Write a protein that binds this ligand. Structure first.
Ligand SMILES: Cc1cc2nc3c(=O)[nH]c(=O)nc-3n(C[C@H](O)[C@H](O)[C@H](O)COP(=O)(O)OP(=O)(O)OC[C@H]3O[C@@H](n4cnc5c(N)ncnc54)[C@H](O)[C@@H]3O)c2cc1C
Ligand SMILES: Cc1cc2nc3c(=O)[nH]c(=O)nc-3n(C[C@H](O)[C@H](O)[C@H](O)COP(=O)(O)OP(=O)(O)OC[C@H]3O[C@@H](n4cnc5c(N)ncnc54)[C@H](O)[C@@H]3O)c2cc1C
Lengths: 340, 340
């Protein structure tokens, strides 16, 4: 079999790797290609801070809940391992803040040592009245992409820097199975109106002492529009911007100020911090992760599609569970092509 | 009314700073001046990471528990302060790891959100079977001294670098009150058998993805002789050395390997971090911290001396509670020339 994986981002490569390993033995000519328009230092997966944390409420798909959990376990089972450094993986604890009470999550047991905030801690953040504290994981995308690649290279997966214009284009030229892991730009390959870019702008600042992450939440501002502070590895991440259908990949001076003024008030130790950089990204926002098969129709023979897009603000967080599901379905494509 | 402080350690500098900040207004002739043999970077303080954590067992003079409490409350009310970054202050969470079940401390209700560890967390550390988790503070010496330095210099205080040979020597030139902060080298000023140095070595290393502290305990080989990893502000601190009566102030090759071999087994990710510095200090070990007031005999009439030394491996932890008692003691003296 010949396999083509469009998309060289976290979703795309995790899959390519996870499809390889699993069916490397039970398939003679398993030849995986990756096509993509922007590689590892230039994707939406790079803009992400990579903090493990799914939506605050149940998604339409509870098949999703298990997925983010699946990633977390795999990740934590490799935090205290040599690779972890190359992976951009490590533990990180922090505050989740609200303006009022609110039910627990779902990942409640998934995350490590989940517990409610205490009065005495709340004091440190005047503007808020209720919140949480727990231990999670950060999977930095720049080290993850880099690692996944080297992993995929030794496996023999080749990479090509081409903008696919159509599944047919690839089918018609030899593709047996096509994995669409093309995120927020999946639209151009197949009109999807439920897939919108929730615009993200962030700030990378040098403030080492920051050791705890601080996501806040206010209903009037909106999902990921409430300020957050995620100390990464070599720098700490300011951010808190969410804007649907704003395909504007460019830093906004007015956003800058709402991130700055916003996070400062949260932790004024920040005011005399240092701005290393400012970046913009698009959360592939969609009601529920598109993870399913499709039957594209051509000249002679029909070719399968495995769609893997729309993870929005929780890409890194749910990546594996999905990349490991997509492989699941890929084995179903083989049983059907009768091979075994 | 001349005051002479000897020792520009955390104890010296902090005490010398309350005596002023809290009396400069009530004494037209208030003269504070500190003498020291070793300044800013060459004190024991400098070798300390500065993690606020007393001893597991209760303090001997039950007043100390109260002083630590005072420290963590003055520190915690300034964690988000305009100066928090200067003082070298920041919150930080982490693990204690015991081999067996072991009673709670007593400061449990003074740190931020104490609690036992779940078994999934104990899976991070195979060698161990039981532990604690909580948020705390780090007061880096290298910067906490430099802070107190400037606060003092603008407050009129003067620093002179000289190796005081005797108490008389100071009295002779007109020391009305002498506040002794000599710490470990206190012995050679007024013989003390109970004040011993527990020599300590550490290792500063480059591993930014460290976010929690990991203090292991191993009663096998006594106090502090178990690895620990305290992430600093610029660099992470390895270590786990307690050696009583060792006045050797030079790094040891077998200590280096103990610091390394031993720390890595805890956090294997460390097996790759770059080594930045190795230093050595002496913990002012003494059955119970010498904070009192003695009437020092000097020829004709007297010259007052306040003792404040022997703060074990928890100088920083309790530094403040003392600097505030000692000024209280500087009050009782000031009320015996019978002044309002
Ligand atoms: C500010 C911000 C903060 C975030 N923080 C977090 C966080 O803390 N935790 C978290 O889990 N997630 C976070 N995310 C989001 C997360 O990073 C993404 O959801 C995850 O990267 C989606 O994987 P992906 O879709 O980005 O793969 P992508 O990066 O979208 O893959 C894109 C690649 O596919 C290629 N491609 C697309 N279409 C075609 C085509 N037609 N032909 C050829 N190639 C094509 C593109 O050229 C591109 O190179 C954040 C996002 C933003 C914007
Ligand atoms: C390896 C190590 C790790 C540690 N980690 C921690 C930690 O995480 N948290 C914590 O709280 N504590 C820690 N400590 C210990 C803690 O830092 C010390 O207890 C605290 O620094 C004591 O303040 P001090 O008494 O040393 O002031 P000092 O450093 O004792 O003041 C010393 C100064 O006084 C001068 N002096 C003394 N006698 C005279 C004299 N006769 N004339 C003139 N000058 C004189 C000296 O020359 C010197 O300049 C650690 C210690 C070590 C060794």
């Amino acid at each position: 079999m010949r396999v083509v994986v469009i998309g060289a981002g976290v979703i795309g490569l995790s899959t390519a790797l996870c499809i390889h390993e699993r069916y490397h033995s039970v398939l003679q000519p398993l030849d995986i290609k990756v096509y993509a328009d922007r590689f590892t230092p230039l994707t939406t997966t790079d803009v992400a801070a990579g903090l493990w944390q799914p939506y605050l409420s149940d998604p339409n798909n509870p098949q999703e809940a298990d997925w983010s959990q699946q990633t977390f376990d795999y990740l934590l089972s490799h935090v205290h391992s040599p690779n972890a450094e190359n992976l951009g993986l490590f533990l990180i604890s922090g505050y989740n803040l609200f303006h009022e009470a609110i039910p627990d999550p779902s990942w409640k047991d998934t995350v490590l040592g989940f517990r409610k905030l205490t009065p005495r801690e709340l004091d440190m953040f005047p503007d808020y009245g209720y919140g949480w504290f727990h231990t999670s994981l950060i999977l930095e995308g720049k080290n993850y992409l880099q690692w996944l690649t080297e992993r995929l290279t030794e496996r023999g997966v080749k990479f090509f820097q081409r903008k696919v214009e159509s599944f047919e284009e690839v089918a018609r030229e030899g593709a047996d199975v096509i994995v669409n892991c093309t995120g927020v730009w999946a639209g151009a390959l197949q009109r999807d109106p439920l897939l919108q870019p929730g615009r993200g702008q962030i700030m990378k600042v040098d403030a080492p002492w920051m050791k705890h992450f601080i996501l806040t939440h206010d209903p009037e501002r909106g999902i990921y529009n409430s300020p957050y502070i995620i100390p990464g590895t070599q720098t700490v991440t300011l951010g808190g911007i969410f804007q649907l259908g704003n395909w504007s990949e460019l830093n906004n001076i007015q956003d800058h100020n709402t991130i700055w003024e916003g996070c400062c008030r949260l932790e004024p130790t920040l005011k005399n911090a240092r701005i290393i950089g400012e970046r913009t990204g698009f959360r592939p926002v969609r009601p529920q992760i598109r993870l399913e098969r499709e039957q594209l129709r051509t000249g002679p023979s029909n070719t399968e599609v495995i769609h893997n897009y729309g993870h929005g603000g929780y890409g890194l967080t749910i990546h594996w569970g999905c990349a490991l599901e997509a492989a699941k379905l890929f084995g179903r494509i083989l049983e059907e092509k009768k091979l075994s």
